[PDB]
Amino acid sequence: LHHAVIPHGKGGRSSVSGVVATVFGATGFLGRYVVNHLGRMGSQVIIPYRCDVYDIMHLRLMGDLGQLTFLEWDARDKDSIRKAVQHSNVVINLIGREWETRNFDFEDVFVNIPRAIAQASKEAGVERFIHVSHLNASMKSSSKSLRSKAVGEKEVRSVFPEAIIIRPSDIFGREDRFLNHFANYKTVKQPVYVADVSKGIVNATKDPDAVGKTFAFTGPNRYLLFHLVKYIFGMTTTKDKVERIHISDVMPTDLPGLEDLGVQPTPLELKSIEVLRRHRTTKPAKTVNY
Amino acid sequence: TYKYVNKKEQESEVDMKSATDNAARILMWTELIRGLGMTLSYLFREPATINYPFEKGPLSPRFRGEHALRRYPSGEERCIACKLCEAICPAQAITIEAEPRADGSRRTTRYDIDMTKCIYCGFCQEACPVDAIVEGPNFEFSTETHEELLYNKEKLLNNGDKWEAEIAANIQADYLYR
């Protein structure tokens, strides 16, 4: 331990939490909450970015003065990852697309980049690595995204055995591609909240009984896709996206879940009202099990 | 002694002459054409504008701008860590921490100023008994982060080395008034 890490304070913005975290995937939708949960307790946060400096200004006010360090990188550029993993204790990976561009295939995104990230982490000498994947991650999958995810989890474990994989399900919040995707206009779903996911990850960042394990972060309830979409329409284009949509959520057996980090599920029936009022110009859904 | 505004010395006359004068004022819109004339006159003058980055506004040898930590001709520092600046600074913006140097002298190890707390009042250079801390002339030191305005001994000494060719002259100018 180095005195610069001893968690002095009272758990607040201007405190110290001993958490030096290099986070990849902060410009997105879940990092926007991971970084807040990290910084509002007094943690140092290295954020690599490839975007323009305008798209990374919603993060300068979520951490105290001097705790946030924004630097630039390029996935294809190695030696731009040593800079960021060095001087850290924890690394968090949140990268992922819902589609394929020219330069970046699912293979690259979910297998080749995380592997180099974990390699550089191990080289540096960090002590925790957290990777996020999908609940339905499996090689047998209509979608090749999940195929690549289940491949990349192993490709990571092969370099960082003590890593921590986290498989949540369809996530719902503001600026999410699930409820807004449905409301833009045989299968059971158990969604989960970004708040819960971020709390879980930021807790695992310190909890000692989380290494070399996996976690299935799923909501408290389950719904039939039809009942859920009708609930959406009552409160109110990609092949792989539609494929991931037309897949039911597994009920992972005895896998260390969400309430094992300390978090508690927040039912969608409470945050749908705040997420959906934007798309305007009721009774709840009957929870079921198959 | 007092005066009256909006009071007439006595009643007026309802004579046809004055009534017609007021009716002309009303119909012909007389009191407004004079304002039009004022605006035209101003159009036909020279504006007070200046090219900023090329033409600069005038200042005085007393201007209080950016801070600087000075030295002696020898090159030795001046701050003897007496903390009068820290004790008078209204905004509690100066943090100081001193020690005996290996050569046995009263000198600082830490001298920090917070420009997001300084009200730029000059009390620190009024108090310094050695003319070591001075609120220099510079005002063009804006930034993009709140962390480039937390100064320190190094930044302030660099600013001193930078601006001494001007601070010294302004002090030579004004030191006979203080």
Binding site: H2, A4, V5, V20, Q44, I46, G66, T69, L71, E72, K83, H87, S88, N89 | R71, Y72, P73, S74, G75, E76, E77, R78, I80, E99, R101, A102, D103, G104, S105, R106, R107, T109, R110, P129, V130, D131, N152, K153, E154, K155, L157, N158, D161, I171, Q172, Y175
Partner: protein, 94 residues
């Protein structure tokens, strides 16, 4: 003078360096460490010793004002010099 540490960081006029194992070195990444390269402890040593024919000498630093308070120093101890606590100068008795 600035002389670098194993980690590759310059040392200051008060011996400050982030230990190679320190996470606070991040702030310098893609950036620099502002350091002054003119060390008073050496620039004053570069100066010579003044000599006087009087066992007591007054120092002010230069200009009456623009210097420092007039202080009086004793020069009876030929073993060493007489140093000023303000300016660092040192005198001798001849």
């Amino acid at each position: 003078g600035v002389q670098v540490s194993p980690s590759g960081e310059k040392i200051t006029h008060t011996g400050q360096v982030y230990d190679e194992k320190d996470y606070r070195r991040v702030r310098f990444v893609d950036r620099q460490k502002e350091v002054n390269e003119n060390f008073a402890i050496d620039l004053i040593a570069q100066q010579p010793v003044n000599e006087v024919e009087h066992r007591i000498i007054a120092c002010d630093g230069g200009g009456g004002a623009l210097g420092h308070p007039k202080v009086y120093i004793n020069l009876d101890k030929e073993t060493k010099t007489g140093t000023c606590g303000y300016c660092g100068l040192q005198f001798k008795q001849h």
